[PDB]
Amino acid sequence: NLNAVRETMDVLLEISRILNTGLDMETLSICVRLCEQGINPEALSSVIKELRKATEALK
Amino acid sequence: SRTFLVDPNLDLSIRELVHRILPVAASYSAVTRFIEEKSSFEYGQVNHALAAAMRTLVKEHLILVSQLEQLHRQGLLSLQKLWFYIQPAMRTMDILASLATSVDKGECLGGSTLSLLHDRQ
Amino acid sequence: LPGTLPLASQESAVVEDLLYVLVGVDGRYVSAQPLSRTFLVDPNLDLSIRELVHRILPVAASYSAVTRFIEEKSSFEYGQVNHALAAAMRTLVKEHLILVSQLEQLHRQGLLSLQKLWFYIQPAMRTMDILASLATSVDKGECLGGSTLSLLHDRQ
Amino acid sequence: ITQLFDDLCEALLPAANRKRAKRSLKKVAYNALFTNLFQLPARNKILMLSFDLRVGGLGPKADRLEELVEELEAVGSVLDLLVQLMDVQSLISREECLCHSMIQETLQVMEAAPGTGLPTVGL
Amino acid sequence: ITEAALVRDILYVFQGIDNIKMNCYKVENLSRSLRDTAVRLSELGWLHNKIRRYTDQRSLDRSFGLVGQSFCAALHQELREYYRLLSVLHSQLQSLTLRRLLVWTYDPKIRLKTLAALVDHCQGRKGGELASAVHAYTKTGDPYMRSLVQHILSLVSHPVLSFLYRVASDP
Numbered sequence: 001n002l003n004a005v006r007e008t009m010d011v012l013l014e015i016s017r018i019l020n021t022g023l024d025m026e027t028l029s030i031c032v033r034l035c036e037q038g039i040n041p042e043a044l045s046s047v048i049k050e051l052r053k054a055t056e057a058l059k
Numbered sequence: 060s061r062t063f064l065v066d067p068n069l070d071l072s073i074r075e076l077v078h079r080i081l082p083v084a085a086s087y088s089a090v091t092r093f094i095e096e097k098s099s100f101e102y103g104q105v106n107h108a109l110a111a112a113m114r115t116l117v118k119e120h121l122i123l124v125s126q127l128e129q130l131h132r133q134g135l136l137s138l139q140k141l142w143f144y145i146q147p148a149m150r151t152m153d154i155l156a157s158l159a160t161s162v163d164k165g166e167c168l169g170g171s172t173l174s175l176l177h178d179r180q
Numbered sequence: 181l182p183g184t185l186p187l188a189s190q191e192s193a194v195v196e197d198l199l200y201v202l203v204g205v206d207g208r209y210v211s212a213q214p215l216s217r218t219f220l221v222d223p224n225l226d227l228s229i230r231e232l233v234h235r236i237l238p239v240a241a242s243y244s245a246v247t248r249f250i251e252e253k254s255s256f257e258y259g260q261v262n263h264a265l266a267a268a269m270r271t272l273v274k275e276h277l278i279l280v281s282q283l284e285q286l287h288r289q290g291l292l293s294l295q296k297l298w299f300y301i302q303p304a305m306r307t308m309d310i311l312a313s314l315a316t317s318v319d320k321g322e323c324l325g326g327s328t329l330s331l332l333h334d335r336q
Numbered sequence: 337i338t339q340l341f342d343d344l345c346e347a348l349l350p351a352a353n354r355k356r357a358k359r360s361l362k363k364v365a366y367n368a369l370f371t372n373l374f375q376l377p378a379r380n381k382i383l384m385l386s387f388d389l390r391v392g393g394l395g396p397k398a399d400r401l402e403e404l405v406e407e408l409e410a411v412g413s414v415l416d417l418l419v420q421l422m423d424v425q426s427l428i429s430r431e432e433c434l435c436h437s438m439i440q441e442t443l444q445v446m447e448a449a450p451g452t453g454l455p456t457v458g459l
Numbered sequence: 460i461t462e463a464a465l466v467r468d469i470l471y472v473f474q475g476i477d478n479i480k481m482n483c484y485k486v487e488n489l490s491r492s493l494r495d496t497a498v499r500l501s502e503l504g505w506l507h508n509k510i511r512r513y514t515d516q517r518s519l520d521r522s523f524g525l526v527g528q529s530f531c532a533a534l535h536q537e538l539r540e541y542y543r544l545l546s547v548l549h550s551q552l553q554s555l556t557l558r559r560l561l562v563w564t565y566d567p568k569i570r571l572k573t574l575a576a577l578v579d580h581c582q583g584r585k586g587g588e589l590a591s592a593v594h595a596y597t598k599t600g601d602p603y604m605r606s607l608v609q610h611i612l613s614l615v616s617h618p619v620l621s622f623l624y625r626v627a628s629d630p
Contacts, residue, residue, distance in 0.1 A: 034341065043373065045421055122424040144427075205495040263599060275457075276456075446559055
């Protein structure tokens, strides 16, 4: 199965690359596995945009 | 095999750099003459489609000269800036100017023109 | 020929000449001498200048011994420590070259008097005095490896 | 699930206190997760973005976005999360903004007050 | 001779094209404070020749192999960037001076120091023996060089790992 769940995870990177989302390969597997738990994705759109916001105040 | 002449009275700080840009023109005046000749039927059904697929690149080389003149009007095109812009063209028009001179050296038509493209970014 | 030049104006010739010696290139009047560097200023100059010139040079002589420490202790036959010590000792040399650039651009407007110079380089006279002391104490007793990491633990 | 939010908070953390920021960023993850919880098909939302692709050109890319969601059928809640988040003239206009963004980034430091852009003088 | 005139010729000596003529670029008047700084600056352009001759002499013969190409075609991606820097420096000449160049070109005085000394350590090596002589430059420790050469190795060792995923053969 791990061969299938690798391909399905590899295709999903491209549709996140041309949609111009800042999610790299590591943060994607984190968010995919976290969405795979059952958390509502309308909220995750806010934590990433805020974690990236407080990260910019440091630099 | 084209030879060029620049100027008797010009700055030496220019002529040494002019001779660094021309090798993309001389390597171009031997590709456009390969298209207009090896398109004759008496050369097989391979030396044709080789000249067609060798024409689309000439089209994209004519667009790269258009975008330079439109960028030249605003004066943003210095001579030093030119030597860097054409570098993708100095490598491609150096490959085709080597096939078009090695397919006509030993007269090839048919399979012997498909072998040379298998031995030769 | 500074003897035929006025006092308030010839100062504008030394400051733009002295602004080059701090880089490593030789100068017009304040020259360098062959090889711990020794300098020569002028036989006929105002004494009210030479006493202050000798107060600025100790940042150049302390610089001509750091840039020679980089170009030598970068050779492989010195370990994987005497290398990264010479790299991290290079970023400061870069920031010392920016501090000389911003002075020449400020020199064009004439806002740079000799007295004003002695105060600007003070952060550089303290830093290039630290590195010119490590680069002369790592080569005195030949150190490579751990014995070059001990010296940086005993030594703003 | 209590750990998958801890690994997520590590990836978005940019590499270099890196030991207390993760403790404070896990708050921003929880302080923002429960705001929505306190307060329509899936493939249709892609087509509405497929349309806006074809309008501004780049047709085949839009014919690809629909090509994958057709094979991803033979998971629906995952794509619902992603939707939430002259060829030569552009070349000569890029290699010209670089020379405008390279001579500016260094002349803004070369000509200023002595010791502004320098970090060692700020000590 | 004005200082601006020197800034005009130096921007060419950085390439090989010569007041400053051609092993040190002996300049030939002007004050001593100017000739000295030109000498060091002009010499950086001389290095650029030694790295250009190799990627031009060996781009001629067709008996250099498959590794000797990915090396001779990875010394060019590290030269287009050196041609982007010369682009920016020329747009400002229309202000920058000698003492302002030293800080601008203090870093590309090192990359043009490793590459111009990486093509001499591997002169007659072809095939895998070249991918083994650009790896003997990684045991250096210098975090700026070990992260440059450890990239050219990632290109030169791509053809080697192409045969492997597919050792002297006998015809």
